[PDB]
A paper describes a structure:
The flavivirus envelope glycoproteins prM and E drive the assembly of icosahedral, spiky immature particles that bud across the membrane of the endoplasmic reticulum. The immature flavivirus particles that bud into the ER lumen display prM/E protomers in which the pr moiety binds at the domain II tip to cap the fusion loop, avoiding its insertion into the ER membrane. Maturation into infectious virions in the trans-Golgi network involves an acid-pH-driven rearrangement into smooth particles made of (prM/E)2 dimers exposing a furin site for prM cleavage into “pr” and “M”. The flavivirus particle’s life cycle includes three key steps: 1- budding into the neutral pH environment of the ER lumen; 2- transport across the trans-Golgi network (TGN), where the pH is mildly acidic and where the particles undergo a maturation step before exiting to the neutral pH extracellular environment;19,20 and 3- entry via receptor-mediated endocytosis into a target cell, where the mildly acidic endosomal pH triggers E-driven fusion of the viral envelope with the endosomal membrane. The fusogenic conformational change of E is irreversible, and the consecutive steps outlined above require a special particle maturation mechanism in order to avoid premature fusion-triggering in the acidic TGN during exocytosis.
We initially used a similar construct for TBEV prM/E, albeit with a different linker connecting the ectodomains. The single-chain TBEV prMe-linker-sE protein behaved as monomer in solution but crystallized as a dimer. In short, in both the DENV2 and the TBEV structures, the presence of the artificial linker prevented ordering of the 150-loop. The difference was that the DENV2 prMe-linker-sE structure showed a monomer, while the TBEV counterpart is a dimer.
Numbering used by the authors:
A (entry chain A), B (entry chain A): -2 to 13, 18 to 149, 159 to 189, 192 to 367, 370 to 395
C (entry chain D), D (entry chain D): 1 to 80
Amino acid sequence: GGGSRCTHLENRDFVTTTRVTLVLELGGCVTITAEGKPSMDVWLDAIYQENPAKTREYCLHAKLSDTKVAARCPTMGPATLAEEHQGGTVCKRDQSDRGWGNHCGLFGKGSIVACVKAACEAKKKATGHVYDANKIVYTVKVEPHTGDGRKTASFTISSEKTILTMGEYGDVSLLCRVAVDLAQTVILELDKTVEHLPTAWQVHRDWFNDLALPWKHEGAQNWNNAERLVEFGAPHAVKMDVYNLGDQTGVLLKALAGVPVAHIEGTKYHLKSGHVTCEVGLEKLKMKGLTYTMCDKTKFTWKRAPTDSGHDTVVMEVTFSGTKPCRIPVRAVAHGSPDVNVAMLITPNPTIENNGFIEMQLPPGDNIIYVGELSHQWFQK
Amino acid sequence: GGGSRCTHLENRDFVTTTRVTLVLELGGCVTITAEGKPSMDVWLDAIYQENPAKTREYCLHAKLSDTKVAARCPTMGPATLAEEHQGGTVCKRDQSDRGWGNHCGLFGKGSIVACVKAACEAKKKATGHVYDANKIVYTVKVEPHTGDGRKTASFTISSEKTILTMGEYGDVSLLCRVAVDLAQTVILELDKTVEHLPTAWQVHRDWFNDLALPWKHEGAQNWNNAERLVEFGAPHAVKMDVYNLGDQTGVLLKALAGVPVAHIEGTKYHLKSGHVTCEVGLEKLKMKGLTYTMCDKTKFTWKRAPTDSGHDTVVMEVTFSGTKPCRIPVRAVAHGSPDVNVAMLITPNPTIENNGFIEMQLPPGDNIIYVGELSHQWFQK
Amino acid sequence: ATVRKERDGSTVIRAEGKDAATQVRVENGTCVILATDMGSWCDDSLSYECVTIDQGEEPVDVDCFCRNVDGVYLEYGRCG
Amino acid sequence: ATVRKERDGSTVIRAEGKDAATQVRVENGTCVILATDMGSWCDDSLSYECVTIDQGEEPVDVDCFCRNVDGVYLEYGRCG
């Protein structure tokens, strides 16, 4: 290998002195090049919190039960049910036409009230967790970009500095700072059912807090705003039906279309987006191969011929049949100028080790790459 | 009894010559008064069709299965799956980043395709039936509005005339005509589940035909437009997940809020609204009690004293202790004028029968009602 | 259908789908059950007044009515 | 996990949740299964290419990879 992960990412930056200030975005990576120093790949691997605090939970499908209706005749005042002043109920007061044909002395509008008990169907809740800046962890990884190893530093708000040992390449120092409103960021999940849905979504707390659904805190007996999922039928003399507004999963998933899907790995809740600013100290970085002799120019073979890296750099792989380890002779000419070298190594000291990957920058136009006496025509766009 | 149903309805008209042209609305009723003829209550009882034709059915919850993903490297053309040209599948073509780390010679975007089989979950269909003007039936009922019997006439487009026999009251002729676009009116139902929902709703066919859901005709193997309930995840090198958009019941019931709930009684599908225009012939109607002597003025008792009918008429009930049957003496004076009768009978020939209900119109102001020598003060608003 | 007298003087008729369009005897009166949407007894229930109709009156806008018995209520589940 | 050779020369590894972060032997090669969302076998399945990584290359953006064996596919249900 030798740092091939960065060579694959879409968001790749090159930073080319002792310190270097970089911004590390989740899903991106940075390659640091420095004269007389090995190249380093640095990236923000994760931003997560273990066991974040739960927020309120929402009901997606109400379980409606024990519907009761009371009526009073014209002049006889309001119709009442005990369930009007109880928790876990949804009530509606209305008026019905009354007369001699339904036990009233007068013809007119009489009071009618219908109440229903409202609970949540099993496995039909939407849950949330909120982040806390004092408990977030951010993982920064460093790997030598040599082409022949990966180290991890974990940071909090309180622990901003770390020194990583890059084996034989010396030491690298990292001073990282984190940067939106974490206490206003919620990670939303739905209870699992037979259908396949994403793991979770990251939403703004104010949006999560406005969902038109019944809600409660874990452990509460009843649901608040349960009327959101109840519909009352037209009143008859003494009868008024109560209906369900149905399963809200489709409603919620439609509103979540385009919202970023987040990941949960055990007790780790991952932020979908974010960045960290680092100071990378290269003063203790040393090159490996200050003792190795030049590779025999005639013993190379193209394993993978020169190809576009996707980042306006050229990548290749060579096989070596001579004495190992050795420092690889690499150069490139502008077609028509065989004397001047126009190759700018991203892998600065390519070395064949006992059991090869070279990356270079080139000026636009017709060029010829040389890995020893192994040659290849290359046009830089 | 004696025609007390009409006295209870909110939509009540009075029509006061041999023929009479009326409009009969569903949920409404008409009282016909005619000099030297008994009063009649006429109403449109129902507009229905037995066994209407089924329309397309919609899926509310997709059952997703056998998800397969195929990928090709940059330059290697499109990724394909057999399921792309099959029925009962949902497919999405996309591009994924590829390189040496996932078996491609080049770095770049490679083609990726994901396919899923899409069926409907059991009891998760929305069905429709469409009306046909050539098969609609409309039921008109007639009942003597006497206060001491109900007859039904069924009409079609082909059979517009009928003669009903009102027992001793003679005969009544009816010539009825029907009147929106029936072939563009759909009655929508959802399959029954554990929750309580209305029986059905009456919708416009063009609205029913635009529902953004998978659809099919009964008996078809697959669903059309099944992609409406599928969501594809972000593509990785060779893997792309496929998710469900969830149960659409809540989506559909939200759109049906305020839409009129319709009724199904066996094989009868009832229209929620509609009217019929009738010609009612009264030429063969005769009064009953042309032989009965006057009731004894002193043998009445208020069973229910004068009360507002709700239709700017006065209703009451009397008990009689003398010789039966007899014609009830009824009158009313404007307070200050004991000579002049200001009572306008809606029950024109009130009769006490062997095992009583009187309805009158009155001019505004202070009045006194007399049922024999039984009296009652009445202020007309 | 089953009948039970509550401690508040009320009477509760518990009905199922079989009881549709039947007439039952409650104390020294009778009640007519005309509800069309009844099923087997459960939590998904509806409970309301089974209105007493005075002698010589026709019932209006009710699918449960009584004669010669006061304070009657109907309850039914909608399962099955 | 179970292995089966199809008539088209392909190989199908059928895995469950127990198979997460395991290495299996397929013909004269080995495959590493790293899918984290696996469950018991059913209709609610996912099937894709378990990509062969060339010698001296590190796998990138794959949760199933093989060495010294060609045309391998992974399939898993997501029930339980």
